[PDB]
Amino acid sequence: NIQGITKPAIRRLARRGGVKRISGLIYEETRGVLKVFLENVIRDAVTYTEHAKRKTVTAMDVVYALKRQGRTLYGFGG
């Protein structure tokens, strides 16, 4: 599951960041960080849906959740 975010992909992310050489523990630790941040966003998203009385995680609700977190996203919602 979180292991699906694999070493080549973590390397691609780090190269977008700028990193030239990468240590091996980077992959596992980054996987953990991704797990944590995804939990933080999804909790707000699903809570928004339970208020909305919908059974699906709407992208508008996602944008509102990311707005609450402060890591605002533009384009995939009104």
Binding site: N1, R12, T30, T47
Partner: protein, 94 residues
């Protein structure tokens, strides 16, 4: 010719900095997100555009965090990033 170590990595740095594409694969990441969301409300469905939003938000977070990680390493006088760098970056971020 056998490329010396690091040159191809620098090439990829330029390449994926130029590109504007998703660097984590869509179905593995969708499976991951669904696995997280099992806990909060089981059997929950996802709008696909919503999944895309989670994905690019995560991409931005990890990209900025790797930027901070590399800055930490260069401060540490070490070109190779270490986990130490990731903890330092997040601890400064708070």
């Amino acid at each position: 010719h056998r490329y010396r170590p690091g040159t191809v990595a620098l090439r990829e740095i330029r390449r994926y900095q130029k590109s504007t594409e998703l660097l984590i694969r869509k179905l593995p990441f969708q499976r991951l997100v669904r696995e997280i969301a099992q806990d909060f409300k089981t059997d929950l469905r996802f709008q696909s555009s919503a999944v895309m939003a989670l994905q690019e938000a995560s991409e931005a977070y990890l990209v900025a965090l790797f930027e901070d990680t590399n800055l930490c390493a260069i401060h540490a006088k070490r070109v190779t990033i270490m986990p130490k760098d990731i903890q330092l970056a997040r601890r400064i971020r708070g």
